[PDB]
Amino acid sequence: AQNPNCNIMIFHPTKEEFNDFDKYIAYMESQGAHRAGLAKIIPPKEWKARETYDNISEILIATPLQQVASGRAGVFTQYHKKKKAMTVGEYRHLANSKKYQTPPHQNFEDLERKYWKNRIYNSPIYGADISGSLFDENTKQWNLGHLGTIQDLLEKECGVVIEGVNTPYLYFGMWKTTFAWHTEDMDLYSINYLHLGEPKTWYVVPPEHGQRLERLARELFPGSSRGCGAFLRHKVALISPTVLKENGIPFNRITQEAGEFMVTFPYGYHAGFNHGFNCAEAINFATPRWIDYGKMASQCSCGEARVTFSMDAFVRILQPERYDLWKRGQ
Ligand SMILES: NCCc1ccc(O)c(O)c1
Ligand SMILES: O=C(O)CNC(=O)C(=O)O
Numbered sequence: 369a370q371n372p373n374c375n376i377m378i379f380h381p382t383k384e385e386f387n388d389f390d391k392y393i394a395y396m397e398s399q400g401a402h403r404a405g406l407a408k409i410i411p412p413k414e415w416k417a418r419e420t421y422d423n424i425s426e427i428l429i430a431t432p433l434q435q436v437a438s439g440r441a442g443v444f445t446q447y448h449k450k451k452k453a454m455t456v457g458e459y460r461h462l463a464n465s466k467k468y469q470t471p472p473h474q475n476f477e478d479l480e481r482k483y484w485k486n487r488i489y490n491s492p493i494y495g496a497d498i499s500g501s502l503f504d505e506n507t508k509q510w511n512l513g514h515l516g517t518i519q520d521l522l523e524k525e526c527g528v529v530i531e532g533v534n535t536p537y538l539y540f541g542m543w544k545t546t547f548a549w550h551t552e553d554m555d556l557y558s559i560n561y562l563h564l565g566e567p568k569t570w571y572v573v574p575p576e577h578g579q580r581l582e583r584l585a586r587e588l589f590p591g592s593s594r595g596c597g598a599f600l601r602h603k604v605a606l607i608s609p610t611v612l613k614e615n616g617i618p619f620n621r622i623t624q625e626a627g628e629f630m631v632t633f634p635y636g637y638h639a640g641f642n643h644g645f646n647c648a649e650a651i652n653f654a655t656p657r658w659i660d661y662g663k664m665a666s667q668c669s670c671g672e673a674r675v676t677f678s679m680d681a682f683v684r685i686l687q688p689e690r691y692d693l694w695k696r697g698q
């Protein structure tokens with residue numbers, strides 16, 4: 369069995385290998401990459417996402433989110449307070465201001481230490497889930513706006529025709545902006561390209577051990593766990609690497625830099641933070657191997673979790689027993 373220790377693998381495809389997206393995902397899995405829950409893909413040197421990021425300042429962040437924490441340094445939740453709209457230009461200036469800028473630090477490890485020590489005492493502002501793309505339409509390889517759709521995958525695999533679209537989202541981050549522990553909707557894959565700016569650090573639990581993280585989360589957030597059978601779907605819980613180690617949860621970490629792709633695999637729990645001002649683009653996708661994970665995905669029905677339009681059809685077709693109860697909560 370490939371990659372039995374579930375290490376995060378890093379890939380360096382040639383420009384030839386970078387032509388067929390599906391084929392290369394399949395190749396990575398043949399080498400055991402999915403066992404980690406997360407992989408890094410470094411594009412061939414000949415490739416670029418777009419010519420420049422010169423005039424991105426006029427993009428609007430309609431609903432910036434202030435991420436307010438509660439709890440202790442290693443175990444906390446965050447809630448999102450809506451702020452007034454601002455342009456990416458205004459947001460970048462805010463990120464670089466004395467209140468919000470990255471502190472002096474020696475290296476990634478020093479900065480990681482500072483993050484887990486001090487995150488809860490600040491409330492950084494995130495521009496998340498902004499529908500759009502920064503890939504040039506003429507970029508033919510690994511263009512996250514030109515992927516095959518999950519709806520077409522389901523149709524090809526299972527012969528069912530369904531409504532729905534899926535499109536990419538932009539994320540503008542600053543120092544300490546945080547993504548909570550989660551898997552994707554319907555335990556899909558995700559792919560994330562860091563277009564510009566400072567790094568993003570990721571933590572990930574191997575899919576074969578996801579239930580260990582769920583069990584720990586129930587112990588660490590007991591009220592939340594009583595309110596919902598799948599509260600990690602709410603995407604508000606953080607647990608530090610120190611606390612994960614103390615409780616024997618298997619995980620790995622890696623830092624993504626500008627110009628690099630990350631792929632998360634079905635039921636790979638992940639969390640992380642941004643080092644400073646940056647812009648990433650991400651989208652969910654499916655492969656034939658996803659279908660079984662989609663059928664088994666645990667759902668939030670307390671009503672807290674957000675659901676796009678397109679998730680309806682996934683639940684309706686793959687989880688018809690759950691559909692009625694789930695739809696009551698959307
Ligand atoms: N009960 C279904 C599985 C499960 C358990 C705990 C969680 O936090 C979660 O998101 C999902
Ligand atoms: O970049 C972020 O803030 C979060 N991204 C993801 O969880 C992802 O790409 O799957």
Ligand code: NI
Nearest residue numbers: 551552558632
């Ligand atoms: Ni994700």
Ligand SMILES: [Zn+2]
Nearest residue numbers: 596668670672
């Ligand atoms: Zn819920």
